[PDB]
Amino acid sequence: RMKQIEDKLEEILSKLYHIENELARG
Amino acid sequence: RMKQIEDKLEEILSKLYHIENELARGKKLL
């Protein structure tokens, strides 16, 4: 429940790092 | 409740896939 929200957060954050890599390339 | 939180989380996530895909569409066409 609280872990579940944190878990999803962690995934969200990984996407943001992947969006930064897409930007570093372009 | 957690219902709204869970829906916001999925919507956040989906918007993130969308952005990633816009960025990817852009590098191709460049």
Place this chain on the structure above:
Amino acid sequence: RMKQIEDKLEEILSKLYHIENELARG
């Protein structure tokens, strides 16, 4: 506590919509 997390979520989501507008322009 649960509102607080939701509140922050809502802000996060507004940024994502603003990032979409920045992309629609460029």
Place this chain on the structure above:
Amino acid sequence: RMKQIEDKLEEILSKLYHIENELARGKKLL
């Protein structure tokens, strides 16, 4: 706990400001 959640939320937020600012830096130089 909520401590970790709150730190992840701030970090999410900060990364979002950063991205917005990279996008804004890019449109100027274009």
